[PDB]
Amino acid sequence: FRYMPFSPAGTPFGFTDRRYLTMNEVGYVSTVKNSEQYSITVSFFDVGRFREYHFEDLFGYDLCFLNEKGTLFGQSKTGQIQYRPHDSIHSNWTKIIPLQAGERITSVAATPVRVIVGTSLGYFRSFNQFGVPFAVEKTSPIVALTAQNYRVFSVHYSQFHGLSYSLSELGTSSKRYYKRECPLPMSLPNINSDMKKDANLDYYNFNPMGIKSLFFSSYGDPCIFGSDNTLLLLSKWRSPEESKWLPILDSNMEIWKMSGGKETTDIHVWPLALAYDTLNCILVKGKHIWPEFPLPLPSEMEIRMPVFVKSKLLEENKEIQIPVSMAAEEEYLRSKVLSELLTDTLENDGEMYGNENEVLAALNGAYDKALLRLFASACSDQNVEKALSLAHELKQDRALTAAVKISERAELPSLVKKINNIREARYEQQLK
């Protein structure tokens, strides 16, 4: 197998003379073939904050990573990297990564405080924002790297284990692992024989794994966006025995819902980042699945739990109208997942933006409110058992009181007594 230079949300040249090196929520880095050299352009979406600039590339950078404080460039073949801070405070620095025979740099990543370089032999070379090297580590061959603050999300590949991921933190002394080479259940591309003349074959030659992008969420949870266009979030990554990859967005399903249930073959999603519950992305219209020039304005796609069936949505519609009974099930699941993640985040890292406790408060509120809608539909069908199970999942005691009044309105006195038993049991466990 041949390792390819990877960068988040990178696009190939294809049949043009220009492509995108990397791309995320901060901005986009493009490069244009200029006769014998290259012209790299670093642009930003918040035009007020940063000023777009461009320079001449005499080396042929094919690796890039962008953060809010600087831009990192890398050459997969020569092993030369260069970190260019956006601000003029610190100067740009350049190092040359040692590469053995046939060893290529496969991915680079940079935060305001850390710089990571990964090779095809599995070398994990890390530096600080000024170029002071850390310990050099030997791991599985790296195919994708992303980082946020002091934490690193690495994707490894081999002919033995297959596709694995590691989640680590680059401390002041050495590197500490939260997770080391656990299975990465990302769907791999399925290339056919008719794909040998398909228009999108060039991408899967430029990115064999199909990893369109990977990144940490706004709240610090690892995410990945494979060729199946499904956003996978890693839940409970602090507890190894509880680690779960949760599919939280079927972008193909959303586009189907936004198009009025009509199957389109020209609209694709290009992921940038995940903000709480919203996927910042680029909506690409055309034959190719990757964005070309000029780049549209970023769009915002809210995450939806993959619990929607196309056949049921078409019948309920006779935008795609979603039945409230089915939509309440998704809102319950989505709230449960978001609440569970943000709670783990606040109990270990505290706050990071200042309003998380307010977000979690309304999040748990929408959790019970959507859960009470399921409880109402259960009482409407006289299903006492299914309603009681729904009531057990309620969080706030004031939500239990609402379920009691709903049960009274439904004339289910046996259920009312059983719901009040939960209030007594929760009062008992709080005192013991």
Binding site: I255, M258, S259, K262, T264, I267, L283, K285, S299, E300, M301, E319
Partner: peptide
């Protein structure tokens, strides 16, 4: 709400 309008425009 703005994204659903954009997709409607891109189909149109």
């Amino acid at each position: 709400v703005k994204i659903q309008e954009t997709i409607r425009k891109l189909n149109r």
